[PDB]
Design a protein around this ligand. Structure first.
Ligand SMILES: OC[C@H]1O[C@H](Oc2c[nH]c3ccc(Br)c(Cl)c23)[C@@H](O)[C@@H](O)[C@@H]1O
Ligand SMILES: OC[C@H]1O[C@H](Oc2c[nH]c3ccc(Br)c(Cl)c23)[C@@H](O)[C@@H](O)[C@@H]1O
Ligand SMILES: [Ca+2]
Ligand SMILES: [Ca+2]
Ligand SMILES: [Mn+2]
Ligand SMILES: [Mn+2]
Lengths: 234, 234
């Protein structure tokens, strides 16, 4: 199986796999059962921004979600990611719909990763517009770029309606080196902005930012509640 | 008095104010009595690098010191810096000597600060060479730039010998805005490289990176063990 570290913006409460009974943000370490959650005050039709950071001295993964002029939600978890992840990884975003649905529109995505050895290596990307044929992104499943230059992670109809039972992802083309033998310290920071809309009072299922093995693929069975990240709910 | 947050590279153990009995790195929050220390494997005559980071969601200040090919030392402390510090600050480096002494040579210094509001603001500087008349630095006390483009925080003789009972600092000219009312998240990262040499088996006293009120000045009495940061040892 893949090795997965994610931050979930989870809009649909699946109590049976341990979601709290409200939309929330989560830190996912090699499971869909979030190590740490916080109440997400979901605003449909409103553009949101998520920021994520981590470094290897502090060993705390953190995320904050907000909407313009509105309050913020934060989530943190103490974890040494270089004991969890392999040295080389790819970074990406995922989303799903299920029985219920929502547009999973990414308007922009940026990412910075640094590696210092005791003897600096660096990668940075930002997309504020996605191109119609994004050579620097590996698009998986249902994911596509639209005419407005937005990245849609899940299916929508020509008229704009989201569809159910969809899974999509986008990975940055280049692998990222997150730890080394002579390494002193590593860190990363990521930002995206997103637009989720639904014709459902209980929109579903959510969006993640994730880091994984370089050859990561959409696992069979990973639909709806599993956010296109895990083959099961263990 | 000033409001002070620092990371100390402390070479001289003053047990009476709570130093451990070995060189160490420390997180100083509004006292010289470090909230968190770690054993510093001091290497005199060897160039070292220190990296420091923090963000306001994670609320963990961290630092790591190393020398080329040699092992690392890390220190961390959970602290919400925006409850400790004022909104506007200046950043700087300090050093001292006392009865014992050491060169306190800074070879390079860099700093990045970010502020995001829910509606990004940014500052970055790096010096890999300091100029002979550094208009972008506020030099305090004994601090000067030499002909090699290094920043010497404390007195040295023309022949290169460090002198005792010296205090010096360098602040970045521009104030930094670290928190706001509508702010979502703030972070900073700082790096310097340093060269400490001594004709003493017990070199003294150390170097800090620090953040403080914008009108910060060398406090009277702040010499030797107080690292040019605090008027007393409380
Ligand atoms: O999109 C929302 C959810 O729809 C599905 O689970 C269901 C939620 N309500 C239901 C009601 C009936 C049945 Br049948 C099913 Cl599987 C479900 C599944 O696809 C879940 O993974 C997903 O989280
Ligand atoms: O530079 C080392 C130290 O020298 C001084 O403290 C002393 C260390 N050894 C001593 C021995 C004698 C006397 Br007198 C004094 Cl004050 C001291 C003081 O200046 C200290 O602040 C400083 O840490
Ligand atoms: Ca869910
Ligand atoms: Ca000391
Ligand atoms: Mn969840
Ligand atoms: Mn100390």
């Amino acid at each position: 199986a893949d090795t997965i570290v994610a931050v979930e913006l989870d809009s649909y409460p699946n109590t049976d796999i341990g979601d709290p009974n409200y939309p929330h943000i989560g830190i996912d370490i090699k499971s869909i059962r979030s190590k740490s959650t916080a109440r997400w005050n979901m605003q449909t039709g409103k553009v949101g921004t998520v920021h994520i950071s981590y470094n290897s001295v502090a060993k705390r993964l953190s995320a904050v979600v907000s909407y313009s002029g509105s309050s913020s939600t934060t989530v943190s978890y103490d974890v040494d990611l270089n004991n969890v992840l392999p040295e080389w990884v790819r970074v990406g975003l995922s989303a799903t719909t299920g029985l219920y649905k929502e547009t999973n529109t990414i308007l922009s995505w940026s990412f910075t990763s640094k590696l210092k050895t005791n003897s600096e290596n660096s990668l940075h990307f930002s997309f504020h517009k996605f191109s119609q044929n994004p050579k620097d992104l590996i698009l998986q499943g249902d994911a596509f770029t639209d005419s407005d230059g937005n990245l849609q992670l899940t299916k929508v109809s020509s008229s704009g309606d989201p569809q159910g039972n969809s899974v999509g992802r986008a990975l940055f083309y280049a692998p990222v080196h997150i730890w080394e033998k002579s390494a002193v310290v590593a860190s990363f920071d990521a930002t995206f902005t997103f637009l989720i809309k639904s014709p459902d009072r209980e929109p579903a299922d959510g969006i993640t930012f994730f880091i994984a093995n370089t050859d990561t693929s959409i696992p069979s069975g990973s639909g709806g509640r599993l956010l296109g990240l895990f083959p099961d709910a263990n």
